[PDB]
Design a protein around this ligand. Structure first.
Ligand SMILES: [Cl-]
Ligand SMILES: [K+]
Lengths: 20, 108
């Protein structure tokens, strides 16, 4: 059929800190 | 109480040494005389050089705690007198301003 084949960064608040 | 997570701001894990610092420390005894004016102590200043509490207070920038304050005074059933023992938060001291009130001196 075809003759030619080749043809938000900042959220509302500051990040929380999680316990280690 | 220990500081809750909702109120904390510093992010490092705190050290809570417990029994080595939450215990009773007895300071130098005062002598009550018929003409005594009264005394004061500042917290936590009183213990910054005493025991493991003192060491932690000096090794860390941040400190926090409550206190159980116990004042003792014995006398006989024939003695009389009354001491008012009170806790004044943020006890800022002032001077007599040179007596005349003209000198803006400060407590040392
Ligand atoms: Cl003064
Ligand atoms: K957040």
């Amino acid at each position: 059929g075809d003759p030619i084949a080749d043809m938000l960064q900042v959220l509302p608040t500051a990040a929380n800190t999680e316990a280690s | 109480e220990y500081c809750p997570d909702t109120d904390a701001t510093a992010v490092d894990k705190p050290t809570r040494p417990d029994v080595s610092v939450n215990r009773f420390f007895t300071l130098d005894t005062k002598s009550w005389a018929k003409d005594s004016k009264g005394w004061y102590w500042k917290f936590p200043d009183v213990l910054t050089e005493v025991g493991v509490f003192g060491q932690n207070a000096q090794f860390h920038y941040l400190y926090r705690s409550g206190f159980c304050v116990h004042v003792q005074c014995n006398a006989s059933k024939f003695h009389q007198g009354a001491l008012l023992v009170a806790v004044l938060p943020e006890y800022v001291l002032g001077t007599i301003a040179g007596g005349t009130g003209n000198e803006n001196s400060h407590p040392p």
